[model samples]
Target chain A: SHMTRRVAIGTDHPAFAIHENLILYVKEAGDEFVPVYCGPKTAESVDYPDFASRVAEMVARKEVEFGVLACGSGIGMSIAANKVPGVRAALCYDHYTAAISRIHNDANIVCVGERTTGVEVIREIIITFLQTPFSGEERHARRIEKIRAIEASHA
Target chain B: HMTRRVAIGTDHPAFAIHENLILYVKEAGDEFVPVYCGPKTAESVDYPDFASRVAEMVARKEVEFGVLACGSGIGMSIAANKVPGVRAALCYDHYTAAISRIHNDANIVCVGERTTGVEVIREIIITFLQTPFSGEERHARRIEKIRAIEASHA
Candidate 1:
């Protein structure tokens, strides 16, 4: 069951190519990889919310351990995906970003940009992201703890 | 780029209403997602599922932020933030929504179906989406604690 962890991938029109590249990587990643697209069909003007909902549902239910969402700039999906409780989504365009989102942010969803980052780079970024683990340390943990308390309070 | 990101949500009860107000956001919030909760229990839907979806996307960076809506928005808000990365807030009005995202860096924004009007809802969505999460250590530290709880569960 532990090794059965899966990931769902999603994207809208702006990041179709990047999403396609990620799909290929997920396939190569083996049986544990599962990709979910935001749109039912390509070229369709679908809403980022629809895709965000699908991927977040999978992670929340533990059906998928992670998610990858792509868009032109990686903003829309990131904004929408956070509504699901207990989930972390990060927008990363580079390898360093891929690592920090894991180490510092504990992000479970990694989004790429088709316009900002091409397909090949998107694949590499995803690989780096999936390979990293959250560096649970006193400093990192303490910081994340403070963030949680702040979020819980009302403005 | 104006990359300060956040997430948002709206449920079935408030779906149509949000749909009307969301149009105004097309200008500022070129990138945003709304987490929707289905209330028509006749269809056998799950609130946590939608909640998880929103949180997961926001946490993973798929979406910069989140927003959720339901009949009263209370249930959706509670369920959405239960996850590790989510800091979901039920913002009944525009000012609260804006301040939550700006000062608290709330990743998820929650709204009620029967709570506000289209004009007001639009304003809330606009301000929430536009504001940047303060990068202050206090805010980041608070979000990290919630993330640690999820790691503990894992």
Candidate 2:
């Protein structure tokens, strides 16, 4: 279990200020968890979906083991990332939401709100999100299947 | 204050707490009215269908807001957000609840029955109902970008 894991991160202009903080959150997850930054390079205003989809696609394609996205309130990133097939993105606000996203939803991407969540609180969430694991239980699997079914039926 | 209609939907597990959900709507604000759009019983049912019910209601402006509950709230948020105009916030605490409205102008609050307690859920609903959007220019631009994403996908 000493394998190195890549964690992709992306952020829009509103959240650019905390991109490095998120990288720290990722690195804080563990030594094995590497941070792969794919967000905006400058503070210039950019669309959130562009970055959200970028990191989400990385996770969906298995280019990364996980993803982290941030926008003003994390609503758009969470909304946009989940549109990609095979990407289960969760908008985590606290430790409980963070851990539950992993334990129950098997979320591949953790979305945070820079304006909504305090910087230090964001740290707590990212750490919880990256460290938690899926339950791998029967009920949760069935729920995941149902989610897949919904996605399939739509497009 | 004008009566604010809030749609509430839940899957089987969350159905057990549906009454409290409804009760909490009033506890949040006297003008808040609970609209029960969830399943009638606690039988096994897919969460997306229930999520769709309330999301469509909120999207259509049939209700002022929506609250969706399931085991983890993740699936509900994902499913509800697919409906254009529904900014569903999968929140577990007061901070997310308040921020979701203040920053995102979220129309729906998604909660988890298994992950959060009933008391906390009440607090979430109350906080969500009480909070108003800040409508700052940057945050509004971000929300518009979110709408553009939905429009592009559509």
Best by DockQ: 2
Tell me candidate 2's interface RMSD: 3.5
lDDT of 1 by residue, B1-154 (tens): 5554444444555555555544545645666534333343334445566667667877787777676766556787888777666777778566798779866778677765554434445667677778887888887887777677888987
Model 2 Cα lDDT, one tens digit per residue, A1-155 = 77889999999998999999999989998999999999999999899999998999999899999999999999999999999999999998876788889999999999999999999789988998989999999999999999999999998
Per-residue error (Å), model 2, residue B14:
20
lDDT of 2 at A77: 97
**Residues forming the 10-long window of minimal summed lDDT in candidate 2 chain B:** B90-99
Candidate 2 local lDDT, residue B115:
97
Cα displacement (Å) at residue A25, model 1: 1.6
Tens digits of per-residue lDDT for model 1 on A57-145? 88878788899887766778888887777567898877799899999878889876664553445666788788788999888878767
| Candidate 2, B1-154: lDDT as tens digits | 6799999999999998999999999999789999998999868899999999999999999999999999989999999999999999999886789889999999999999999998779888998999999979999999999999999989
